[PDB]
């Protein structure tokens, strides 16, 4: 069963390549020893990124792990070759980035062009219905409740990227969506596991206005109330209509423990959820649309921490926004990307 199986991951803001040790219950970094670009592309294809490959180099291990994985100097799949070595010869572990992501417009309300190049508007019947985040030239992260029946068919959806104004999303200009995959454990009753993937029929052309956001790795080591950003065409006022122009705002993460308080959401926040906003209220984080991006800046990289899931009203006290926890979905996303190609 694919869920029971795992293998490989990227850990931390420095993309430390980690392999799981059969029967030892543990992750181990990889020695730079005899590593090259081909091995990095192999690991990326193992994670489901296909021919995508950005960089691979040697960095210092900051995870504090027990042992490393060193490829047998010559054993003749090279995957088994990696045995439990106590140290690396090159004194360096493998940093591997499979795709150029997390970069936007440097600092220089209404969103600026290129400020959120991963933001996409998802339309049905020529009308902006949801938002999403670019992760590959052909893959978009959104919410599962956006694509529930009867919108589970990919032919209902068109994606618009690099465009800030809805009025400038004309009939014909958006990329057709080929596949829609809801999370298998999505529960519309509780909005648990509210995440879905859209694969486009045609690859996006990346530029200053259209770029992907990095998927979050385990061990990001974010602050308890880490400052994050939300963006979208979300109605600023309740019951309001879709904002014509793209907007963005800053929010702070809210501890899940504090978010599950009785006088907040009273144990409705699951491990598949994170909370963000402001508890006291009065702060307009309503700009975001459902499935839109929740991102944070760490190690000078923009990471997708959450996708807009649910929330009682908006800018309401004791009712912060609840987002899907992309960190716990990154493996499922990798699996879906690998199973496609």
């Amino acid at each position: 069963n694919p869920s029971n199986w795992c293998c490989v991951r990227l850990y931390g803001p420095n993309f430390i390549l980690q392999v799981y040790s059969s029967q030892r219950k543990s992750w181990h970094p990889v020695c730079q020893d005899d590593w090259n670009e081909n091995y990095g592309r192999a690991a990326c294809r193992d994670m489901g990124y296909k021919n995508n490959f950005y960089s691979s180099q040697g960095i210092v291990d900051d995870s504090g792990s027990t042992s490393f994985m060193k490829l047998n100097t010559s054993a003749g799949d090279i995957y088994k070759k990696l045995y439990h070595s106590d140290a690396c010869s090159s004194k360096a572990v493998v940093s591997l980035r499979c795709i150029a992501c997390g970069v936007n417009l440097n600092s220089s309300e209404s969103a600026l062009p290129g400020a959120w190049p991963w933001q996409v508007s998802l339309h049905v019947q020529n009308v902006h219905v949801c938002g999403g985040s670019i992760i590959t030239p052909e893959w978009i992260v959104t919410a599962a409740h956006c694509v529930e029946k009867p919108l589970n068919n990919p032919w209902h959806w068109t994606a618009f990227a690099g465009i800030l104004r809805q009025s400038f999303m004309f009939y014909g200009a958006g990329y057709q969506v080929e596949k829609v995959i809801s999370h298998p454990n999505y529960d519309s009753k509780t909005k648990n596991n509210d995440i879905a993937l859209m694969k486009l029929q045609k690859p996006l052309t990346f530029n200053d206005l259209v770029k992907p956001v990095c998927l979050p790795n385990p061990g990001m080591m974010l602050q308890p109330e880490q400052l994050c950003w939300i963006s979208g065409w979300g109605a600023t006022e309740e019951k309001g209509k879709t904002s014509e122009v793209l907007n963005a705002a800053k929010v702070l993460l809210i501890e899940t423990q504090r978010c599950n308080s009785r006088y907040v959401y009273d144990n409705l926040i699951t491990p598949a959820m994170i909370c963000a906003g402001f508890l006291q209220g009065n702060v307009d984080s309503c700009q975001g649309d459902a499935g839109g991006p929740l991102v944070t800046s760490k190690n000078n990289i923009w990471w997708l921490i959450g996708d807009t899931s649910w929330g009682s009203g908006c800018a309401k006290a004791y009712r912060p926004g609840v987002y899907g926890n992309v960190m716990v979905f990154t493996d499922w996303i990798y699996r879906q990307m690998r199973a496609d190609g």
Partner: nanobody
Amino acid sequence: QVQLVESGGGLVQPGGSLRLSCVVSGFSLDYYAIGWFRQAPGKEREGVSCIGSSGDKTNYADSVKGRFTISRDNAKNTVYLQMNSLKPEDTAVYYCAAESALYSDCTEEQNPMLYDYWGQGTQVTVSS
């Protein structure tokens, strides 16, 4: 439903050993750090040990450093705390708690507010 279930507590002689176990349900250990905390009678809850989502990162408070040992079984979704050379000072209610991996896996000082999910705990008393 997510549950954390502690067991293995009991009454033991000073210098004895115990093995606490914590069964985790509702989420994967690959994305969450698991800590053992203890609360003495009428004292604040203090961090005892921590194992990260990677399984290699382990941290221990100086009061039990080198005497206790935390471990995890991902296949069994069970975290074990081996308490060796138990002292009367170790008498407390031992709780199992889970924190996400978005934040730091294991800290030197275990902040109980970073841990989002809690079990009911098991009583450990170390006396003659």
